[PDB]
């Protein structure tokens, strides 16, 4: 079904617009392993992240064609869809580079 095209260490955040604050995705602070999964049958991509500790899925987001991926800093990247704003606070610049490369590749071939 789906192939992982990258793995990156990041704390996954979502933006609480009513309170103007970032909050941990899934409700629990800490780092996750964040994949981009490619579904080859229909050429779709998804961001799926799981907490290192307890394997909880904290993000499971489609990547639509035309997404604006904002590399705010070398270690915090973010994007939005029609409901939520997502942020990734990467564990290193290398993790940020790996993930942005895969994301940019996804956006090119979509």
């Amino acid at each position: 079904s789906e192939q992982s095209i990258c793995q990156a260490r990041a704390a996954v955040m979502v933006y609480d617009d009513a309170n103007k604050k970032w909050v941990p995705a899934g409700g629990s602070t800490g780092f996750s392993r964040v994949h981009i999964y490619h579904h080859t049958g229909n050429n779709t991509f998804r961001v799926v992240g799981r907490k290192i500790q307890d394997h909880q899925v904290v993000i499971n987001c489609a990547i639509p064609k035309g997404l604006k991926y904002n590399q705010a800093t070398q270690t915090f990247h973010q994007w939005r869809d029609a409901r939520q704003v997502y942020g990734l606070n990467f564990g290193s610049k290398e993790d940020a580079n790996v993930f942005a490369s895969a994301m940019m590749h996804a956006l090119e071939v979509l």
């Binding site: 955040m13 103007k20 970032w22 904002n70 705010a72 973010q78 942020g87 606070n89």
Partner: peptide
Amino acid sequence: XPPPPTE
């Protein structure tokens, strides 16, 4: 896009 988080 919102500013990046803090400590």
